[PDB]
Design an enzyme around this catalytic site. Structure first.
Site, short mmCIF file in Angstrom:
data_model
loop_
_atom_site.label_atom_id
_atom_site.label_comp_id
_atom_site.label_asym_id
_atom_site.label_seq_id
_atom_site.Cartn_x
_atom_site.Cartn_y
_atom_site.Cartn_z
CG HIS A 1 -5.54 -6.68 -10.13
ND1 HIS A 1 -4.41 -6.36 -10.86
CD2 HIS A 1 -5.54 -5.85 -9.05
CE1 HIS A 1 -3.77 -5.37 -10.25
NE2 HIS A 1 -4.43 -5.05 -9.16
CB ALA A 2 -4.72 -9.13 -5.23
CG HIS B 1 -1.53 -4.51 -0.38
ND1 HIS B 1 -1.04 -3.23 -0.38
CD2 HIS B 1 -2.76 -4.44 -0.94
CE1 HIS B 1 -1.92 -2.42 -0.93
NE2 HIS B 1 -2.98 -3.13 -1.28
CD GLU B 2 -5.29 -7.29 -1.86
OE1 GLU B 2 -6.45 -7.00 -1.50
OE2 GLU B 2 -4.66 -6.63 -2.70
CG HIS C 1 -7.09 -3.46 1.36
ND1 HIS C 1 -6.97 -2.09 1.45
CD2 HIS C 1 -6.49 -3.82 0.20
CE1 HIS C 1 -6.30 -1.64 0.40
NE2 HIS C 1 -5.99 -2.67 -0.37
CD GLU D 1 -4.84 0.45 -1.85
OE1 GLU D 1 -4.16 -0.60 -1.88
OE2 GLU D 1 -6.06 0.48 -2.14
CG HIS E 1 -4.96 -0.01 -11.00
ND1 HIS E 1 -4.04 -1.00 -11.28
CD2 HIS E 1 -5.18 -0.08 -9.67
CE1 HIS E 1 -3.71 -1.63 -10.16
NE2 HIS E 1 -4.39 -1.08 -9.17
CE1 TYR F 1 -3.07 0.58 -4.84
CE2 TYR F 1 -3.41 1.55 -7.00
CZ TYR F 1 -3.78 0.65 -6.02
OH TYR F 1 -4.86 -0.16 -6.25
O1 3ES Z 1 -8.78 -4.32 -2.86
C1 3ES Z 1 -8.60 -3.13 -3.12
N1 3ES Z 1 -7.85 -2.68 -4.12
C2 3ES Z 1 -7.12 -3.54 -5.05
C3 3ES Z 1 -7.30 -3.01 -6.48
C4 3ES Z 1 -8.79 -2.95 -6.86
C5 3ES Z 1 -9.55 -1.82 -6.58
C6 3ES Z 1 -10.91 -1.78 -6.92
C7 3ES Z 1 -11.50 -2.87 -7.56
C8 3ES Z 1 -10.74 -4.01 -7.84
C9 3ES Z 1 -9.38 -4.05 -7.50
P1 3ES Z 1 -5.36 -3.58 -4.52
O2 3ES Z 1 -4.76 -2.23 -4.69
O3 3ES Z 1 -5.42 -4.08 -3.02
C10 3ES Z 1 -4.50 -4.90 -5.42
C11 3ES Z 1 -2.99 -4.64 -5.64
C12 3ES Z 1 -2.24 -4.46 -4.31
C13 3ES Z 1 -0.76 -4.90 -4.30
C14 3ES Z 1 0.08 -5.27 -5.27
C15 3ES Z 1 1.28 -5.55 -4.74
C16 3ES Z 1 2.44 -5.98 -5.40
C17 3ES Z 1 3.69 -5.76 -4.81
C18 3ES Z 1 4.85 -6.19 -5.46
C19 3ES Z 1 4.77 -6.84 -6.69
C20 3ES Z 1 3.52 -7.06 -7.27
C21 3ES Z 1 2.37 -6.63 -6.62
N2 3ES Z 1 1.21 -5.38 -3.42
O4 3ES Z 1 -0.09 -4.96 -3.12
C22 3ES Z 1 -2.78 -3.46 -6.61
O5 3ES Z 1 -3.60 -3.22 -7.49
N3 3ES Z 1 -1.65 -2.77 -6.45
C23 3ES Z 1 -1.25 -1.71 -7.39
C24 3ES Z 1 -0.21 -0.75 -6.80
C25 3ES Z 1 0.83 -1.36 -5.84
C26 3ES Z 1 2.05 -1.81 -6.34
C27 3ES Z 1 3.00 -2.35 -5.47
C28 3ES Z 1 2.73 -2.42 -4.10
O6 3ES Z 1 3.66 -2.94 -3.24
C29 3ES Z 1 1.51 -1.96 -3.60
C30 3ES Z 1 0.56 -1.43 -4.47
C31 3ES Z 1 -0.71 -2.40 -8.66
O7 3ES Z 1 -0.68 -3.65 -8.64
O8 3ES Z 1 -0.39 -1.70 -9.64
O9 3ES Z 1 -9.20 -2.14 -2.39
C32 3ES Z 1 -9.93 -2.42 -1.18
C33 3ES Z 1 -10.52 -1.30 -0.59
C34 3ES Z 1 -11.88 -1.27 -0.29
C35 3ES Z 1 -12.45 -0.13 0.29
C36 3ES Z 1 -11.67 0.99 0.57
C37 3ES Z 1 -10.31 0.97 0.26
C38 3ES Z 1 -9.74 -0.17 -0.32
ZN ZN Z 2 -4.76 -2.46 -1.96
#
Ligand code: 3ES
Ligand code: ZN
Ligand code: 3ES
Ligand SMILES: *[C@@H]1O[C@H](CO[C@@H]2O[C@@H](C)[C@@H](O)[C@@H](O)[C@@H]2O)[C@@H](O[C@@H]2O[C@H](CO)[C@@H](O[C@@H]3O[C@H](CO)[C@@H](O)[C@H](O)[C@@H]3O)[C@H](O)[C@H]2NC(C)=O)[C@H](O)[C@H]1NC(C)=O
Ligand code: NAG
Ligand code: CL
Ligand code: CL
EC number: 3.4.15.1
Length: 581
Positions: A314-315, A344-345, A348, A372, A470, A480
């Site tokens: 998980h990214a 997205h990453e 951050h 985010e 999550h 989000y």
């Molecule tokens: O790395 C994270 N957080 C990750 C999750 C995490 C948290 C804590 C520990 C370990 C992991 P993520 O949300 O980047 C990692 C990813 C992001 C994502 C998914 C997508 C995406 C878009 C289209 C299709 C498929 C995927 N785009 O971006 C994430 O968990 N996203 C959520 C919600 C999301 C969905 C779609 C979207 O476009 C954006 C966000 C999810 O996947 O359910 O946080 C960093 C940080 C550090 C300090 C302070 C603030 C933030």
């Molecule tokens: Zn994120």
């Protein structure tokens, strides 16, 4: 005493830098190499950081935040007074850290296999099936199998997790863990604010839902889709039906205007994970924003190891709290979806770099939604047909509606999903939902908010929330929902700064130094100021507002209403009790 507070904050920063840096390394080493040894070292650093947090937290509690004059020192001390899990007694702390470890490990190593012996992992195997399969039974196998293997395996841990996370919250002055999570937004009206934003997106979501349901009726057959009922949850191109653009091909408004296979284009033209991240880096620098350091390229894990290493795929983006070391850990696949994720990453990472000179206590976003949002803002411009053509990944109102549809399938569909996840958890945390109610209440919200139904009956011992990252990883989700609202506000403002006129959806901020500097000034603030100040710096107003999102999608709303009226669609799901026969 003002001078003693200032002195305390200085000592906290100096020692926090070392301890958090050490914790991050151990955390990283486990995430990128799940072994017995890396697990032992991580749980040891858990003890070290807890000791540090308890020491300075206890000290911080001797200061009256209100009697302090400097607001930066005021904010830091308030934050340090919350010991979080470190408030637990020794035995409960050890139990809690192990539960978290076991839940995350269980989710990340779960596989779904067939009778023969073929085993599929979530990334990329099951993700690809959900995205590309157009066969009802194959989608069902993956959807149900993932829940059987991952979800069921989290259930044994969850009640104790809830007990301990609530205990910690209460020890830090909150009523439950959900209360503490909500309080991080520093906004008394938060719940009502979020409810109102959800309600504003209802006409857009209900029309999208009705239109997609009709399209699914067309492909999967009249016997499998109720035109007045909820949609079976395995048919939306995504394991959690949270974002729907992977089924664009089934729903395209004007198929006379086709788009090419973007996956095929990226693969054939030589795209790699490294090149995907360079591309995101290049987009950021085009705004006059910061490039990632050479260290990022040497230390990051940008693809799943072929070492034999087991990893958490998980990214995520990693700040090592030394102002120099920033990393992304992602099992990147070569496709457009993961290019968006890469952006997205990298958002951050940009944020990390922007606030790197602030004290450690303030090295986070104005709120978690801001953090985010950053990457997603840039990804909105990345996704435009204009920018994708410039990258050679692709080669009139019909094209406009097609594009708005593709965007809506993700951005609009996600609104009810991102809203419900923590509606569920806040109610688990406050005791409204207990273990014998977990799954049933989950599906009641899935029905109420998204208009979905499970394709197969849910049985004793099912824990479908466990099958969503999550949940076992204890990552709050409302960030989000906030992100998706505010990213359109930021897009609107940056586009105005870039000089864009006409339909908001036609804006591409690539090359705009004005757009870049608007974001940079707000990001540099970190957590130093209440979030409405950062909101105002970017947008010119202090509120969360659904206005910009509605403006972006207005032409689609008009098109959807007319199209749905022509087919006499019932908006919503009157036959709410319907499930597949
Ligand atoms: O790395 C994270 N957080 C990750 C999750 C995490 C948290 C804590 C520990 C370990 C992991 P993520 O949300 O980047 C990692 C990813 C992001 C994502 C998914 C997508 C995406 C878009 C289209 C299709 C498929 C995927 N785009 O971006 C994430 O968990 N996203 C959520 C919600 C999301 C969905 C779609 C979207 O476009 C954006 C966000 C999810 O996947 O359910 O946080 C960093 C940080 C550090 C300090 C302070 C603030 C933030
Ligand atoms: Zn994120
Ligand atoms: O967002 C929070 N907690 C934040 C407060 C909050 C609670 C509820 C709702 C809203 C906000 P806070 O203490 O800054 C959150 C902070 C810094 C941090 C690191 C990360 C992160 C993200 C992806 C990968 C690796 C890390 N995200 O935030 C924090 O967790 N501090 C730790 C120290 C730490 C440092 C580095 C690290 O990799 C992990 C932990 C502590 O105080 O113990 O909890 C989520 C979470 C879940 C799993 C892993 C990390 C984070
Ligand atoms: C309230 O206190 C903050 C923070 O003060 C800092 O931390 C304390 C614990 C002590 O160690 C202090 O000695 C320390 O300054 C003050 O914010 C700070 O203000 C100063 C001066 O305006 C900023 O210095 C600037 O630095 C940049 C880059 O080096 C230069 O370009 C500028 O010329 C200037 O010197 C400093 O960055 C800033 N720090 C933070 C974290 O915000 C704040 O001014 C104070 N408020 C009041 C009303 O007194
Ligand atoms: C993974 O961790 C083990 C210890 O369990 C260690 O021997 C090994 O070097 C690590 N692998 C990599 C590729 O770093
Ligand atoms: Cl589910
Ligand atoms: Cl949050």
């Amino acid at each position: 005493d003002e001078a003693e507070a200032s002195k305390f904050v200085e000592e906290y920063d100096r020692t926090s830098q070392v301890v958090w840096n050490e914790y991050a390394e151990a955390n990283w080493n486990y995430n990128t190499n799940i072994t017995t040894e890396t697990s032992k070292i991580l749980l040891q650093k858990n003890m070290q950081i807890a000791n540090h947090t308890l020491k300075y937290g206890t000290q911080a509690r001797k200061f009256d935040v209100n009697q302090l004059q400097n607001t930066t020192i005021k904010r830091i001390i308030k934050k340090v007074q919350d010991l979080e899990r470190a408030a637990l007694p020794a035995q409960e702390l050890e139990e809690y850290n192990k539960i978290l470890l076991d839940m995350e490990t269980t989710y990340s190593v779960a596989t779904v296999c067939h009778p023969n012996g073929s085993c599929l992992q979530l990334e990329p195997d099951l993700t690809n099936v959900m995205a590309t399969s157009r066969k009802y039974e194959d989608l069902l196998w993956a959807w149900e199998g993932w829940r059987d293997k991952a979800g069921r395996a989290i259930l044994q841990f969850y009640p104790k997790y809830v007990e301990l996370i609530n205990q910690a919250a209460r020890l830090n002055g909150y009523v439950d863990a959900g209360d503490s999570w909500r309080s991080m937004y520093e906004t008394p009206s938060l719940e009502q604010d979020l409810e109102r934003l959800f309600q504003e997106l209802q006409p857009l979501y209900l029309n999208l839902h009705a239109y997609v349901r009709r399209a699914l009726h067309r492909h999967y057959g009249a016997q499998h889709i109720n035109l007045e009922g909820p949609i079976p949850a395995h048919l939306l191109g995504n394991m959690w039906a949270q974002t729907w653009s992977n089924i664009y091909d089934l729903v395209v408004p004007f198929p006379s205007a086709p788009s090419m296979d973007t996956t095929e284009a990226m693969l054939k033209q030589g795209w790699t994970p490294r090149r995907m991240f360079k591309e995101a880096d290049d987009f950021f620098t085009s705004l006059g924003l910061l490039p990632v350091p050479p260290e990022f390229w040497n230390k990051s894990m940008l693809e799943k190891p072929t070492d034999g290493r087991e990893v958490v795929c998980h990214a995520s983006a990693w700040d090592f709290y030394n102002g120099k070391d920033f990393r992304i850990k992602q099992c990147t696949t070569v496709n457009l979806e993961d290019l968006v994720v890469a952006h997205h990453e990298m958002g951050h990472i940009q944020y990390f770099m922007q606030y790197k000179d602030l004290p450690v206590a303030l090295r986070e976003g104005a709120n978690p939604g801001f953090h985010e949002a950053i990457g997603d803002v840039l990804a909105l411009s990345v996704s435009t047909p204009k920018h994708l053509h410039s990258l050679n990944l692709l080669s009139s109102d019909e094209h406009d509606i097609n594009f708005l549809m593709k965007m809506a399938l993700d951005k609009i569909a996600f609104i009810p999903f991102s809203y419900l996840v923590d509606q569920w958890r806040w109610r688990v945390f406050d005791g409204s939902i207990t273990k014998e109610n977990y799954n049933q209440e989950w599906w009641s919200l899935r029905l109420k908010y998204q208009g979905l139904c499970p394709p197969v009956p849910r049985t004793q011992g099912d824990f479908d929330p466990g099958a969503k990252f999550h949940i076992p990883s204890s990552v709050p989700y409302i960030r989000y929902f906030v992100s998706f609202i505010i990213q359109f506000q930021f897009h609107e403002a940056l586009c105005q700064a870039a000089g864009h006129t006409g339909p908001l959806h036609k804006c591409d901020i690539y090359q705009s130094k004005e757009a870049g500097q608007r974001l940079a000034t707000a990001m540099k603030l970190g957590f130093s100021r209440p979030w409405p100040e950062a909101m105002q710096l970017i947008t010119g107003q202090p509120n969360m507002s659904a206005s910009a999102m509605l403006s972006y999608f207005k032409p689609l709303l008009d098109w959807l209403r007319t199209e749905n009226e022509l087919h006499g669609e019932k908006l919503g799901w009157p036959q709410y009790n319907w499930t597949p026969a």
